[PDB]
Design a protein around this ligand. Structure first.
Ligand SMILES: Nc1ncnc2c1ncn2[C@@H]1O[C@H](COP(=O)(O)OP(=O)(O)OP(=O)(O)O)[C@@H](O)[C@H]1O
Ligand SMILES: Nc1ncnc2c1ncn2[C@@H]1O[C@H](COP(=O)(O)OP(=O)(O)O)[C@@H](O)[C@H]1O
Ligand SMILES: Nc1ncnc2c1ncn2[C@@H]1O[C@H](COP(=O)(O)OP(=O)(O)O)[C@@H](O)[C@H]1O
Ligand SMILES: Nc1ncnc2c1ncn2[C@@H]1O[C@H](COP(=O)(O)OP(=O)(O)O)[C@@H](O)[C@H]1O
Ligand SMILES: [Mg+2]
Lengths: 96, 269, 192, 909, 96, 48
């Protein structure tokens, strides 16, 4: 496990390590759906022989099979468009 | 049959094309040198404007089709000569400005720059001292890039002088409303009376002009717009350090008005 | 001018500015310069436009507090809105330095020496039905000044005193004639 | 100075009532009026006492206060006043040194000056420079800084401290420039609706009216500029025909673009000089006046003109088309000119289509011919409804010329000064004459800037576009203030612009300053009896490039009947749909043109002689189906459209012809002679198409899908009828030269999946910019330079792909709008980076036959070799704005409506 | 105007002029954050003003409110105006 | 031989064309102006 904040200095570096090493990843302070995280949230896996690689910005990075991604949110609105909500299933902790 | 008119105009312009020279005037900077600076520019430039509008007047003649080729010559000739003069006056004014400042407080990173500009200007002015015919600047050894590069290096030494300008603006308080362009004049031209009468109006709004004593070493009176004249109660010693007589102007104006009010009320009561 | 002079002198006694206002074309701008003439100061009339830098206003303020001149900031209304907000902190700092008889104030880092015979004023219109694009001033910034009403001037008194001053003798008849011509011509002729 | 006529009289009546017998005394001086009448005598104007009164009045006001407004309508003599008072004063008075700004064309920070934000460095401006130049001059001068432009408060209030009782101009740095007792500001203007009354009370004023103007006093000087070979007849005909026809047009007032009086006069006059006889002069008067009306009034305009002429023509039915010949003295026969030069080599370029010379095109050419000749340097603007035939006919009239150099620039809602400046400076010399540097067309004589759209650029929040203000500056003063502080003239340039009628949204209205300077008229839709002839003469050769000598096809009554049927379809579809439904029910005859030029793609060979009605009619119905049908949203409208299409095909021939070919799929993958990938230049009509089956297309898809999943992600793609439909529709548009798509649908459905597969099956490179954290616009510019370099140099067929999550900065849709519409991206490359890159293209430019510079060839290769794919979600909030705010984004690319699977297929999944 | 009451309160309860205040405008935000951190460490007060103009700044402000580790006697005083499109999260974590 | 030239002089002869030097050396005139190095831009490029 590694847990990271949204407005954090080492975001993309730790994201690269979490995609490579096969971590289970939890993101704290999400304000919506990041622009970076679209092909990783989808399925975009070009094959290199037996493995698969996935696009993160400019790099080409091996998609480890132990990749599990969760992310938290502190405000029910912000932020989803109607494009990044048909792939992401949304859960609302609420006081009833 | 008015071809003789166009021919007559071209003979007039040819008579112009041999005569005109400069007015070579010995001028001395702070350290002792002497260069032939050039005055009476408008006399030269207005003739050029007259000649170009005269060529435009020749362009409306119906017999222009047989004489177009000489008009092309004089067109390109005046088109070069105008830009050359209208650059050289800039270079002259900015060089006169920036000689004494780098002369007095020499910082060598500025000095190498301004010495190269000094060499590149005085080398041109020596060849003008040799031949003073006005169409020789059309026929020198590629002066165009020399003039443009001297202008560009002066722009760059201005950008170097920004910091010293803010130092003197923090020194004397009224300078925040003078531009840089006049402030470095008043810093450099610390004795020139034409500069003082041309730019002391915009500093103190009341004084429109001042007088001078018999040797131009003291200021004794001040004027108005309509010519209201008030003498000063004491002479004002001019010097090089500009704040060290502007402060004297401020104090001596206030003391003069103060004693003049007392004298008036003392007789009036 | 009785109204204007007393409001501005009491506002200077309390260590604040002065904000005369009203409709267009009255005399509020020249009234400040007239007060500076009757007092013995120097007046540096400005204009405030385009949304200039708060550092650009700061250096102007540094010049005014070092010299000792009244900034008559004509058209302080039309200025970019957040610039007004930072300028509010600047003016408050200067007015604190005045009221506590401070010799050394401090804005934009340096220790600028403030002058005791200083002063700041503005002039403005209210952003009415046809006064163009002007943004409304902050409430905090309004609390720093002291507003003066300058709505209606007179027309008979000025016109008779001017004509009596200019060598003409029959001012008391003709001034009323002028003012009645103005009022009738404005009043009945078709409003272009 | 302020008053009209009657209000000045009533003011005089009031002055009598306050002061009983002390009424009047006039202007004391006259020796300046002698010089004023002298200067009018010099410059060959007329001499009107009213102009004299106004000029003496202006000199009084200029002595009195600091600034003068000159209120007046368009063209009604408000600039000649100061223009002649200049010389009339300068003959005796000292020096009148004129500086001329136009304050709306250039941006603010160049005009009033501004500061570099990071450097703290004062950049100078235009009139700050002019103020320094005037305060340099000695005491024996006078100068008139003139701002000949419209009025906004947020700049004109910056001069309150100048126009004060005080006289001072201030910089924002604190630098303050005074003024002496010399200077005046003169503000020529149009109206003062938008000025605050601080300025109105601050400066002097001169009023002008539409009652003081003398029309005959401008007819006479124009008659004095005539070469004395026709003036007897022209004056005899003007003096008894002109005033009636002018006052009747001012009575009707149904004119489509608003002009002043002077504008209507000049539009009447500039179609006249060179008439011979009376019957020709009538028709020149009609073409002068009636161009600005509309068709409800032009007909009775012609009726009253011919009826209150001598006689009536034999064009009693439709009298808009009278062809006066000089050769015989013929009045009117409207004749149709049919070409007979018809192959498929004409249609090779998408442009340069063979223009069928119909009588309305002849009326347009008879309109154009007097103004584009080398004796009448006239700027003019066509008006037409959108998609009607403007650009084609104006390019034909460009081709009729002699030594010109056309340079078309597509304007839009972002077009500014610098874009037209660089489109000029790519093809124009820089030669340095006397009186300032100037621009001259290279290797030609009359360069023509063809501005495509004028309604479309953007107002500010007062109503004044900077583009139209700039072109007003150019067409009035023949120059502009270039930056780096120097005026730059122009030499030999026309401006012939185009526009549509201001009906829809995004179409602003034009100021009356720009309208009454230059010329204009209007034209109408080609109607049904014309369009049947146009598309009959298109449908005969494109058919008869094959099976020309066979049974039913030929004997071209049937070829005419097919075109008449399609025109009936087009008319009923425009009758049943509108633009109030959605943003994109676009219907021009551009659709009919693309439709009937689609039929090159099909194997219409007919050597195996069929029925053969069904084999070509089902082809026609499928092409019509995939053009019209696939943009209709609601299902009930789809059923109504089916009823329309079927009712047409049954009313034309019997019944039951469309019956059962819903299983057909005309795809690239299989045709005659094995369509089948090499061959990287494209055919002139794309790869040809052919008939297939469902299951066979399934095997072709499975083969290409296996080959895709070899070197990509292995795809678990299912199959049902709708995916077969969608892949057929993507293939039959991406196999067109220069095709693009707008995919409007729900999220989640496969769109990028099918387009990636078809991009792999046709071997085209697919490209999509991969966003990161630091998104910019510089990033996007470099990626567009990459794609444009590849697709416009190496002749490779490229598919570009942008989706919703990548538009991360709001100018991206505008760049894609331009790159769709024109073929260029404006302000992308510099000047130095085009010659070492386009340098290897001159060889093929030499061999192919394409002329002009190399950059047009580069743009043409990009227009042939670049495909754009936009995936946009339907129920996003910004979809309506980003379909209305870019009009070419639903005119260029075909728009498929992917939303919603069937009820039937969700059962089968 | 609340400013005079706050000034008199800061003169009453504290001494040595601990009271520090910054208005919100063009070019004051990035020094406002620095003064926020510094007066959080010092324990001295801070009065921000006019938080209805800088509406696209307040996510940074709520992030820094969530992140910081204050001391005792620190008191943050805000001043805003009635404004639509405000951010809920700092409205949750404040008195009104 | 190419490495011999690029060691000895500072240039590689016959490498660039003429058209591919001005859009590339075009951002160097500013530092060329400020530094004091004269002549054309290509000698400054070789010196760097
Ligand atoms: N004395 C005269 N006799 C005949 N025609 C005249 C006379 N004076 C001016 N004109 C004509 O009036 C026309 C318009 O003049 P002017 O430009 O002053 O009008 P304007 O309203 O300033 O134009 P704009 O509407 O562009 O501002 C000119 O074409 C000129 O030929
Ligand atoms: N009390 C007064 N006596 C004489 N003239 C006045 C007086 N008040 C105003 N004026 C004149 O009115 C004009 C405008 O005054 P100003 O202060 O500029 O008003 P505003 O700023 O509203 O235009 C000035 O020229 C001034 O000379
Ligand atoms: N008389 C005609 N004969 C044949 N085709 C025509 C005729 N008039 C118009 N068209 C068709 O209409 C189209 C008009 O395009 P155009 O109106 O120039 O576009 P825009 O309105 O964008 O300038 C042409 O492409 C042409 O195919
Ligand atoms: N017809 C289909 N059969 C099987 N899977 C499909 C089909 N259409 C879409 N999908 C699924 O949709 C996913 C891709 O969706 P995508 O094309 O990214 O949606 P969008 O085009 O809206 O971005 C693939 O994982 C694929 O499994
Ligand atoms: Mg005019």
């Amino acid at each position: 496990l590694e847990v990271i904040n949204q407005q954090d200095s080492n975001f993309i570096t730790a994201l690269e390590l979490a995609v490579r090493f096969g971590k289970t990843l939890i993101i704290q302070e999400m304000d919506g759906v990041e622009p970076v995280l679209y092909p990783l949230l989808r399925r975009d896996l070009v094959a290199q022989g037996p493995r698969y690689v996935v696009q993160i910005g400019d790099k080409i990075i091996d998609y480890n099979e132990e990749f599990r991604l969760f992310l938290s949110t502190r405000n029910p609105n912000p932020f989803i468009p109607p494009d990044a909500a048909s792939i992401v299933t949304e859960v609302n902790f609420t006081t009833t | 049959q008015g071809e003789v008119t166009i021919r007559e105009a071209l003979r007039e312009l040819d008579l112009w094309g041999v005569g005109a020279v400069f007015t070579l005037i010995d001028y001395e900077d702070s350290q002792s040198r002497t260069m032939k600076l050039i005055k009476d520019w408008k006399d030269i430039v207005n003739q050029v404007g007259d000649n170009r509008c005269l060529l435009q007047s020749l362009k409306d003649s119906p017999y222009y089709k047989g004489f177009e080729d000489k008009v092309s010559i004089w067109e390109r000739k005046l088109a070069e000569l105008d830009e050359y003069l209208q650059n050289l006056n800039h270079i002259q004014r900015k060089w006169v400005y920036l000689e004494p400042i780098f002369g007095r407080g020499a910082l060598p990173k500025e000095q190498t720059r301004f010495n190269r500009v000094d060499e590149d200007f005085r080398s041109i002015m020596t060849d003008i001292k040799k031949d003073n015919r006005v169409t020789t600047l059309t026929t020198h050894a590629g002066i165009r890039n020399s003039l443009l590069t001297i202008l560009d290096q002066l722009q760059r030494c201005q950008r170097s002088l920004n910091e010293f300008l803010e130092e003197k603006r923090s020194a004397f308080p009224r300078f925040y409303f003078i531009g840089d362009d006049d402030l470095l004049e008043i810093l450099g031209q610390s004795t020139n009376p034409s500069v003082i009468q041309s730019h002391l109006k915009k500093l103190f709004a009341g004084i429109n002009s001042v007088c001078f004593d018999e040797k131009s070493k003291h200021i004794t009176a001040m004027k108005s717009l309509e010519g209201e004249v008030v003498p000063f109660k004491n002479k004002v010693p001019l010097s090089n350090n500009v704040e060290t007589w502007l402060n004297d102007l401020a104090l001596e104006m206030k003391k003069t008005l103060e004693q003049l009010l007392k004298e008036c009320v003392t007789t009036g009561r | 001018t009785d109204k204007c002079y007393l409001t501005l002198t009491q506002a200077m006694k309390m260590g604040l500015g002065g904000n005369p206002y009203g409709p267009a074309g009255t005399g509020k701008t020249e009234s400040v310069k007239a007060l500076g003439g009757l007092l013995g100061r120097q007046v540096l009339v400005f204009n405030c436009d385009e949304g200039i830098d708060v550092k650009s206003m700061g250096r102007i303020f540094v010049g005014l507090v070092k010299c000792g001149a009244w900034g008559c900031f004509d058209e302080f209304n039309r200025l970019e809105e957040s610039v007004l907000s930072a300028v509010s902190m600047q003016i408050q700092t200067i007015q604190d330095a005045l009221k506590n008889h401070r010799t050394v104030c401090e804005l934009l880092g340096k220790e600028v020496e403030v002058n005791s015979n200083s002063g700041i004023f503005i002039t403005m219109n209210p952003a009415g039905k046809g006064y163009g694009g002007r943004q409304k001033l902050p409430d905090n910034l309004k609390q720093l000044f002291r507003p003066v009403a300058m709505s209606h001037p007179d027309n008979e008194l000025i016109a008779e005193v001017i004509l009596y001053s200019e060598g003409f003798k029959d001012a008391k008849v003709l001034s009323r004639k002028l003012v009645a011509i103005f009022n009738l011509s404005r009043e009945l002729l078709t409003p272009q | 100075s302020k008053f009209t006529f009657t209000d000045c009289t009533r003011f005089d009546a009031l002055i009598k009532d306050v002061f009983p017998g002390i009424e009047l005394k006039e202007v004391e001086y006259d020796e300046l009026s002698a010089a004023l009448k002298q200067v009018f005598e010099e410059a060959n104007y007329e001499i009107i006492p009213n102009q004299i009164k106004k000029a003496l009045e202006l000199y009084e006001q200029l002595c009195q206060r600091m600034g003068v407004v000159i209120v007046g309508p368009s063209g009604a003599g408000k600039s000649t006043l100061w223009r002649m008072l200049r010389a009339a004063l300068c003959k005796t008075g000292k020096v009148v040194k004129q500086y001329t700004m136009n304050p709306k064309a250039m941006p603010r920070y160049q005009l009033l000056g501004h500061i570099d934000m990071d450097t703290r460095e004062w950049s100078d401006g235009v009139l700050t420079n002019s103020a320094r130049q005037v305060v340099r001059e000695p005491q024996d001068v006078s100068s008139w800084i003139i701002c000949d432009g419209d009025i906004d408060p947020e700049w004109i209030e910056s001069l309150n401290s100048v126009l004060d009782d005080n006289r001072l101009l201030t910089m924002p740095s604190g630098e303050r420039i005074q003024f002496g007792p010399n200077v005046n500001f003169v503000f020529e203007t149009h109206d003062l609706s938008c000025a605050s009354p601080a300025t109105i009370s601050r400066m002097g004023m001169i009023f002008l009216s539409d009652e003081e103007t003398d029309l005959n006093s401008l007819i006479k000087s124009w008659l004095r500029n005539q070469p004395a070979e026709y003036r007897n007849n022209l004056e005899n005909w003007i003096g008894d025909y002109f005033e009636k026809a002018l006052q009747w047009v001012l009575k009707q007032n149904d004119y489509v673009v608003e002009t002043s009086l002077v504008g209507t006069v000049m539009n009447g006059l500039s179609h006249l000089h060179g008439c011979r006889d009376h019957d020709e002069f009538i028709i020149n008067l009609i073409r002068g006046l009636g161009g600005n009306l509309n068709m409800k009034s032009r007909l009775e305009f012609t009726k009253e003109v011919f009826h209150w002429a001598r006689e009536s023509p034999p064009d009693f039915h439709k009298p808009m088309d009278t062809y006066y010949d000089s050769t015989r003295g013929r009045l009117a026969t409207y004749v149709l000119k049919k070409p007979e030069d018809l192959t498929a080599d004409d249609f090779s370029n998408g442009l340069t289509l063979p223009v069928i010379q119909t009588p309305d095109m002849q009326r347009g050419l008879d309109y154009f011919k007097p103004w584009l000749s080398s004796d009448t340097k006239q700027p003019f603007i066509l008006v037409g409804p959108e998609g009607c035939g403007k650009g084609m006919l104006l390019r034909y009239a460009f081709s009729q010329l002699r030594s010109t150099q056309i340079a078309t620039v597509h304007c839009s809602a972002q077009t500014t000064s610098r874009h037209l400046l660089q489109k000029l400076s790519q093809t124009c010399m820089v030669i340095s004459t006397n009186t300032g540097r100037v621009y001259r067309p290279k290797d030609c004589e009359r360069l023509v800037l063809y501005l495509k759209d004028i309604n479309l650029p953007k107002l500010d929040k007062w109503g004044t576009s900077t583009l139209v203000a700039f072109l007003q500056q150019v067409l009035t003063y023949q120059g502009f203030y270039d930056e780096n502080l120097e005026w730059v003239g122009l030499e030999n340039i026309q401006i012939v612009a185009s526009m549509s009628a201001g009906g829809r949204l995004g179409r602003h209205k034009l100021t009356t300053r720009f309208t009454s300077i230059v010329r204009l008229c209007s034209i109408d839709y080609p109607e049904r009896e014309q369009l049947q002839t146009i598309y009959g003469a298109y449908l005969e050769p494109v058919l008869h490039k094959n099976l020309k000598n066979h049974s039913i096809w030929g004997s071209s009554s049937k070829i005419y009947l097919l075109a008449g049927s399609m025109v009936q379809v087009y008319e009923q579809v425009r009758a049943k749909f509108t633009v109030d439904d959605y943003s994109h029910y676009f219907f021009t005859p551009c659709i009919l043109t693309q439709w009937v030029l689609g039929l090159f793609r099909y194997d219409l060979e007919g050597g195996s002689s069929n029925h053969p009605l069904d084999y070509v009619l089902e082809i026609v119905a499928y092409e019509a189906r995939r053009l019209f049908r696939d943009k209709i949203v609601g299902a009930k409208e789809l059923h109504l459209f089916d009823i329309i299409l079927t009712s047409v095909f049954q009313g034309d021939w019997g019944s039951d012809i469309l019956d059962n070919m819903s299983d057909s799929f005309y795809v690239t993958w299989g045709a005659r002679h094995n369509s089948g990938a090499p061959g990287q230049p494209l055919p002139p009509h794309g790869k040809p198409l052919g008939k297939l089956n469902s299951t066979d297309l399934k095997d072709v898809i499975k083969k290409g899908l296996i080959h895709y999943g070899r070197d990509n992600q292995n795809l678990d793609i299912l199959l049902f009828h709708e995916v077969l439909e969608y892949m057929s529709r993507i293939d039959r548009v991406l196999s067109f030269p220069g095709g693009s798509l707008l995919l409007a649908g729900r999220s989640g459905v496969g769109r990028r999946t099918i387009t990636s597969l078809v991009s792999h099956m046709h071997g085209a490179v697919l490209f999509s910019p991969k966003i990161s954290r630091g998104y910019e616009l510089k990033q996007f510019k470099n990626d567009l330079k990459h794609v444009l370099q590849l697709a416009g140099i190496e002749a490779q067929q490229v598919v570009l792909l942008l989706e919703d999550y990548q538009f991360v900065h709001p100018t991206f849709l505008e760049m894609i709008n331009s790159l769709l519409s024109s073929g260029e991206v404006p302000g992308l490359y510099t000047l130095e980076e085009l010659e070492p890159l386009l340098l290897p293209l001159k060889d093929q430019a030499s061999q192919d036959g394409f002329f002009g510079p190399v950059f047009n060839y580069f743009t043409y290769r990009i227009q042939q070799n670049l495909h754009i794919v936009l995936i946009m979600d339907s129920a996003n909030s910004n979809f309506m704005i980003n379909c209305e705010s870019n009009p070419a984004l639903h005119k260029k690319c075909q728009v498929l409506w992917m939303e919603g699977w069937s009820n039937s297929s969700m059962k089968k999944i | 105007d609340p400013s005079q009451e706050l000034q008199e309160l800061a003169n009453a309860e504290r001494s040595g002029e601990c009271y520090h205040q910054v208005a919100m405008g063009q070019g004051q935000a990035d020094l406002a954050i620095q003064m926020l951190k510094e007066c959080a460490r010092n324990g001295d007060w801070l009065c921000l003003k006019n938080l209805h103009l800088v509406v696209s700044w307040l996510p940074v402000l709520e992030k820094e409110l969530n992140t910081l580790q204050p001391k005792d006697t620190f008191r943050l005083w805000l001043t805003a105006e009635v404004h639509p499109n405000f951010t809920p999260i700092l409205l949750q974590s404040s008195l009104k």
